[PDB]
Amino acid sequence: KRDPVSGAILVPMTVNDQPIEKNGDKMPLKFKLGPLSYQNMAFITAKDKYKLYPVRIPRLDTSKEFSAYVSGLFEIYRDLGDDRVFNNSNFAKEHNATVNLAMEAILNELEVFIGRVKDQDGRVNRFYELEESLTVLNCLRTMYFILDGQDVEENRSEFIESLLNWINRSDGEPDEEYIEQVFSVKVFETQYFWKLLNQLVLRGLLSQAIGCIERSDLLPYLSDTCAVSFDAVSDSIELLKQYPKDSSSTFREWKNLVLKLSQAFGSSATDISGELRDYIEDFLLVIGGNQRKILQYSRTWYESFCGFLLYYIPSLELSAEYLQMSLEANVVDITNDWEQPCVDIISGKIHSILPVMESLDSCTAAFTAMICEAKGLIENIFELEDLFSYRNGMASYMLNSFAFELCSLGDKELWPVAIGLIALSATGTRSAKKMVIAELLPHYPFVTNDDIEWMLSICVEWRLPEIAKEIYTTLGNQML
Template identity: 25%
Template sequence: MSDNFERNFDDIEMLEIPDDESTSETEAISDSSSNNSTKVADRSLYSQEKSYVDLQEWLDSTIPLEFKFDKKQYDQTVGISDSYSQNYVKYVNSLYKLIEGISKSDITRIELEKEDAPIGFTEIDDVNSTRIDRDSVYKDIDSAFGSIVESLGVFLAEIADEETVDESYLLQLHSLLYILQCLQSNYFVSDVKLKPELLAKWVNGFYHKPTNELTEAVMINTPTPYTHPQFWNTYLSQLVSRGLLSQAVEAITHSQYEQLEAEVPELYSVISDLVLLLGNYEPLCLKGSFSEWKLAACEFRDSLAKVSVESENPQHTIMLSQIYDVASIMTGLSKTIAAHCETWYEVYVALALYKIRDDNELYKEFYNIAISEIPPASFEVDTSDMSQICEDCFKNILDENFLKVIKTMHDIEPATASYVSKLLELRSYLTNYYSVASNSKDIDALLNKRTISEYFLTRHAFECLNIHSLVPVGIGLLLNGDIAISEQSKTHNRNVIKDFLPHFKSLTNDDLEWALTICAQLNLLSTARELYYISGLKSLNDGYIFEALNMFVNCYDPTSIEEDGKSDGIKQVHRIVWDMIFQDSLVNNRPVEDDLINNIVTNNVDKSLKIHPVIRQCLSPYAVLHDFFAHLESDDLSSAKKFSKLIHILKFNYLPKKFCPLLLCQYLPFLNDTNSVFQLPDLIVVIDVIDSFYSQATAEELKEGESLYQYSINHIEDVTEPYDWRVTLQKKNIDIPTNLKELSKTIRNAIVAKIGKVYMET
């Protein structure tokens, strides 16, 4: 590899692009996104899951997942900037950053699977330290899971009013949110004191009670709500059993029960004590004093048996009985709780709130009690009924059927499910799904074992590669050593990245720099050259000549003997220099209309703009031609010195022969000018050039030379340069030769005359 290519590749040095005010000094890859009108995404573009080998088959084999690049899908996502697309990309990026953050914190599956050190008299402190470290790690994982739940909530809020988002999709995402809340509240809570409230949030979100109709009937349409037949045994019991205690306090406060103070003071006192008890629940429980509150609740419940209501209104006695039921719910009596609930998960939440808090080991028992009191409905899950899907998933979560949970989530929203699988893996909830052999503590087995999270995250990474804005996420996941642990997976992912990157569209210099950084990280030299080449073609197509030259020269490795080290890049450099720059200048008899190229050949550029030596060398013939045109009208140089520049070009060994006729045309005005002085050697060189052109040029070169000549003499209507040879001949009423044969004859005759004059004068 050449030193220059290695320097550019290793350092990933990009051109230092000046500010917009000096655009004539540089060029940049055009931002295609700014050239396109705003494209609106079809939401299906982000959910076109490809088919992959089954999870279990993949786990039991050594066959890697196959990446399927969908060019049509990828091209459709380039330049999309509608609101839904932006929000979806932002959401996936937020999930990716969580996993990246965990990896950077060195939270890995292997560390979590290490056995605790044996306990001995001298190792107790070390064991305690290990447990503390693990608790800290779990806390970070739980926090990450909470952030996923929060991110999904934000995403839902942002797309709620999108015209491109239908109600069914929003329902799916809301269902996914409830599933995540169920998972979080049961398995990703570091502080057990917060667990009952999280459980209540999950259930209240999924199954909202009391209903709006009941609330309206009891609290709005009834002048004295406390007297409504359903106020205590339905409305208030639902609020209490769901942990909505602030709403319960507010409901009682606004129920007009103060009327009882004069009529039935005993009942009024009971209700006042209930309000106080409900209001004290949260402050006491959150500071760890649940037992104190529970004791007060039990005393309140027991005291109700001693209350005698002296009233002729039998409704007051019924109220006291219903308040006793509410108190029984608050003290965790499962039969009473079940009698006031419709589903097992409502019972489960009430038991968590009021049975015994702050003991994580008892929640399994709460669940067993709940499903024994109200068994889950047995039904064939209707895949079109999100309510059934959620309820089935809730039970799988509590039954610890985590793989079924992941698959259900994956059917709803694959990206979210993929990241959740990683957190489940890190929390050791997926350990039971692996065989005994794969659960070995041998470090080699761990380093080469496949995981469920790797399967889902790798699939997600592949899908990201088919969405332009999510390509960095896909690449990042494939490069994450905590996801793909085995050397086989790492090698396969490297090959996937190598095959994909040439398809990546670099819309800006930053895009290209990022892609080259990936190549440098993985030592993908041939891919880097290909990226330079593709970017060169794009820059050339967009009219950025210098940037195209810079890209092409950087993709060429003159020392490579591999197939990918072929000279396509340098061929493009030669094509640009000769067939675009030099040819344009020559056929139009003026410097090209590219300020940057002209400034480069005249050394009139800022030092911060680095010019590749190969570019300078390849531009040197044009530099001489530019200098010739620049001095053509100058009186400072003699005709001999001016034409010495042409001589240098004509004698250049690598000059394409098709340019010889037009270069010779530059002599015509001077050969017909009696005041022009020529040296005999220069005239002899011209004769040699004419002879060699006709004797050595191929038929194709003769044809090309004729074509360029015809173009030049037939496009002189817009010529403004007074030094143009065509204009000069016309002003002198000298006929312009109509073809190369006449041109050769005209030049030969003129040279013979000049040689004779020089000979006579000497």
């Protein structure tokens, strides 16, 4: 329900009360941004145009789900203590451990948010943007917050489990709706079946894969027609039922049995169709890892990628080579904002994922950069006195940005999270942080006394007593 052209989101002021007619004279439209993000104002200095138009900033999030999400991410932030930054020799090993954990913490907070947004039925637009974010993070996690510069051999189960998650959560496909479009209205012999079967295999959806076979041609056409291939197709199904997800060793042995099986069938009695014959050799080749064939039955670059890792060679040493083969086969779909940021992850350049995420959600983007700086994937290179620029890290920037943004949100519950981010900012002079708070604080939306205390307590903690002169000088004039 939103559309960009000039890179900007174009939107209507009012749905059935827009004051300007394209035929009409050119008019003096005026707009004042308000202290409250959700409360701005547009008006016109012209005759018979005396209506005031309260406007709210496009894509603003006032939801409770969000302020919960923000609070939740702020915990994970201050809880990383010193691990928020990047410097026993296990200091390295333990750092990574507590960080790769905060990453799982984030993914959770976000999955929870996503889930809650799904239940209320406001703009589907926000739910979509958020899910894309999660997918991008799901990729980021798999590629950098599991093996810590190691190889899939170090932690196979965590990796493969995470990889399969990212893949089968990016796009709903193959959606069960399509699976049953391949069954209704001679005898599942057209590619549609195999393309779907191999597709499930490439995606690691073996559970489902075996299910599709056990729905048609296995027990009848085979068991009756050719006995040679019946065995092949069945004890291959058996091999799927036991695809090694934990042991890197069991895999090697596994792939051996897979290849041994295809070699046997490959040169044997063909008592079945000339076509059905090949369809099964292609099925057996995909499982074996034949790149040629993996690319063939791949509908998207990422199914190619997932498959190479799952069946060919599980080593991120070929990640770059895998990506290229996969992209030649099927280019990147620019429809969805997530596919590219993932190609960027898998290929190294991680900074170029931020802008995109800052677009989907300023919040998630800020903390994503934060965790990336913690992990040491991105770092400042830079070389009066305040910093809210490219000067300190990129992550610093986004966090302070999101901080500032929170101040106009009008949610007093998030004001601590705001001042907090500025306080705990990995970089930036203490006096720099002082000045910033000196100006942002007068704007705290205090209601209760407790609030005024928290408020004043910060003037103390930062030596902004002069800011308290004003808190009082005001308090005196408020009653009056």
